């Protein structure tokens with residue numbers, strides 16, 4: 001039914017190194033900010049843990065175990081707090097972090113919205129079975145990105161992945 | 168304590184074919200709508216998934232696997248998002264869907280409010296052990312239905328099933 | 335990133351026998367009430383279940399199984415509804431109830447804020463490995479209690495236990 005207050009709490013999973021990825025994430029953020037069903041959005045790369053004992057940290061890049069633990073746990077906490085996952089999913093460069101997180105959320109029985117992106121529509125349209133069956137809602141990033149502004153995250157209606165060859 | 172905003176998110180479980188069942192559901196919805204502790208109510212039958220490749224689908228009839236998956240997942244998603252379950256539970260015609268959902272929610276450690284209905288109070292008062300022990304709060308549907316309007320769904324105080332013979 | 339509404343739902347775990355304990359709980363409650371990230375706070379001892387069939391029940395005495403079940407379940411329900419745990423943790427008299435609840439919440443992947451108190455700073459600073467590693471954020475109760483008023487419970491940033499000997 002119609003929610004009295006917004007209840008949607010989104011875990012936004014995405015790689016964040018290159019341009020386009022960062023641009024995708026930013027646009028996703030604005031779109032979600034326009035959605036009246038959303039109470040909160042968590043994006044892992046926004047904040048960050050600082051290890052006082054960590055000298056000259058990179059990103060390459062050997063990191064302290066304290067930093068690793070704190071950041072990983074910040075992400076798991078984000079998944080725990082979240083009601084649903086929204087993943088900006090690069091089909092050209094598969095991100096195993098995002099896949100890990102999708103599997104994690106599905107094991108918790110939480111709904112997962114997959115938002116796939118490709119710069120090669122001329123190439124074969126294929127998906128790993130675990131992703132294709134694991135995700136509960138697909139919203140195409142190249143053609144339907146704008147739907148993130150209107151999607152009812154209070155209820156997260158299903159939309160099974162179809163039209164992808166499956167391996 | 169007193170909630171700053173309503174936090175109650177209800178999964179409302181009930182069969183929805185017959186008259187009476189539908190009436191029960193409607194009254195339940197109104198009562199819950201009057202409750203200030205509730206942020207959201209999900210009722211499985213309100214919306215629906217439409218499989219484009221499904222021609223002339225019948226309730227009770229053979230359904231496509233896509234529709235089955237999407238609908239089942241819509242319910243599981245509702246259970247996931249919910250903080251608690253409220254089941255309009257017909258003691259005269261046992262619904263195994265509702266029982267399934269009760270078990271699912273209890274396995275997730277979520278509280279379950281059972282709202283039993285009978286058209287034969289003069290008849291034997293008996294309940295299956297898994298339901299009687301599984302549910303955390305009982306509110307009699309014939310005599311206490313109205314309590315759905317005032318019950319504090321921010322905290323869901325317990326009220327164990329008593330007065331039922333157990334098999 | 336920034337919440338549209340507060341989403342923090344706190345399970346406040348603490349013993350409630352001594353005046354010192356009750357005072358800690360009270361101050362904690364007041365501090366949390368000032369936190370704009372918090373939607374709701376649950377404290378187990380605030381309310382109570384009353385077993386009509388229980389004659390002259392005594393705190394610390396033999397309790398009816400109905401009371402035991404209902405009360406235990408009220409706590410588990412509090413943990414279920416909660417997004418995170420905040421534990422007023424007496425390092426001088428270890429409370430196994432609170433520890434139980436911490437383990438329960440961590441098994442559910444929920445974040446746990448430990449707020450340790452000691453009146454014997456002269457003694458060695460030691461912690462059980464399961465508590466030190468189980469907890470996701472430590473806020474010292476003796477020196478940093480007030481931080482409960484400002485902490486962002488929408489996201490619950492990590493802060494690993496350091497400075498304690500580990501046994």
Ligand SMILES: O=c1[nH]c2nccn2c2nc[nH]c12
Pocket residue numbers: 044045071075097
């Ligand atoms: O720096 C990060 N690398 C990274 N790989 C996977 C998740 N994350 C993550 N979340 C927050 N910061 C980071």
Ligand SMILES: O=c1[nH]c2nccn2c2nc[nH]c12
Pocket residue numbers: 378379405409431
């Ligand atoms: O609500 C309670 N929770 C709880 N955990 C451990 C003991 N207790 C306790 N004793 C009386 N009421 C309670």
